[PDB]
Chains A and B, each alone.
Chain A
Amino acid sequence: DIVMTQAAPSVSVTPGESVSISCRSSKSLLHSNGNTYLYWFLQRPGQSPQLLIYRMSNLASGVPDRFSGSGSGTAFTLRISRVEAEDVGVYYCLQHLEYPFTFGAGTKLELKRADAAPTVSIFPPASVVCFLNNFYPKDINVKWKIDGSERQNGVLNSWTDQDSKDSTYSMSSTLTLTKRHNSYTCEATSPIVKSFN
């Protein structure tokens, strides 16, 4: 079994700058015919994988020359030139020199951007939902309060992956209740707050 290792589960880079992603194989991928059987795929948020680089460093149709590949025989590197917001996703290497074909564990690319505050929207009913959109960084908290009382139970949150246009993150928070109170408020991490009656 040829093992493929991508040691970094993720890597952070500032837009406009460059970054490289490593992949190592337990057996050389170079063949007698003089060709290296290594593939690099990118899987964007919510999409199926797609070819990026084949053989040494051949670029797939439509791939910006900003990408390029290199590497010895068991050591390979995928390098992206001037990282753009649209580059967010997980990069996978793959050998097809020997059966069974095998994938690297994948490396998530993350973008470092300017701090940003969330745009909050609250929506009444039998559940109350709140959106904390386009903020940065990813680590943000939400607080719920009913008639001033800070409710905790009955909340389920959900985050999106880094935005491909602006690199911000967004979150949704739902407060579910028994289909006898007046002030419903949603606030983040002066504070950013939204309520209704």
Chain B
Amino acid sequence: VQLQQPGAELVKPGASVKLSCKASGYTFTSNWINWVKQRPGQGLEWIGNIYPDSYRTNYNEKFKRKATLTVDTSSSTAYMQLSSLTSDDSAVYYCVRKHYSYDGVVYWGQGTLVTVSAAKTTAPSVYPLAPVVTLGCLVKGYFPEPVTLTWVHTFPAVLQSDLYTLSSSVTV
């Protein structure tokens, strides 16, 4: 059971964006696809859903003029277009599958972090951090979020003037 979603999308205010969710590992037309919103550090919000089998849709009134759900059954892909984005639209959007009949079968994709700003992309600039045991790594000056890091404690990114700085530590 898989629902792939791109890590992030930097979007210019006023513009729109189309988010993808590629299903695989289950019968696509047998499950409803739901979309959920979560602002950094906040709770969850139901946006709407679509049943690939019949193409029926349901929308949370709050997002009726903001989102449009479509499914491409030949690619087992679901999509959500968000129109004329504002800063309030910056958040993580999850596609979630739920079997039309069975109730205990609900599964959440990894989510896509949408960042709405005029600023421009900027790759990080990783760094050392070797014992003057615990090794460190200093990912500095990137944009937008997120970044991935693996080898511990990887700390929340910090914003320093239109730029995010992060650090991680390894203790062997």
A residues with a Cβ closer than 8 A to B are 35, 39, 48-51, 54-55, 58, 60-61, 92, 94, 99-106, 119, 121-124, 127, 129, 131, 133, 156-160, 170-172, 174, 176, 196
Contacts and interface: CB of A to CB of B under 8 A. Distances in A.
Contacts of B94: 48-49
B93 to A, nearest CB: 11
Contacts, number: 104
A85 to B, nearest CB: 15
Contact of A158 (B46, B107, B134, B156): B156
B129 A48 contact: no
A170 B46 contact: no
B153 A174 contact: no
A136 to B, nearest CB: 14
B24 interface: no
Contacts of B123: none
B136 A129 contact: yes
A156 B153 CA distance: 17
Contacts of B108: 48-50
5 contacts: A39-B106, A50-B108, A55-B103, A103-B45, A160-B156
A119 B160 CA distance: 26
Interface range on chain B: under 10, 10 to 19, 20 to 34, or 35 or more?
35 or more
Interface string B29-49: 000001000000001111000
B158 interface: yes
B16 to A, nearest CB: 22
A28 to B, nearest CB: 18
A172 to B, nearest CB: 4
A125 to B, nearest CB: 9
B104 interface: yes
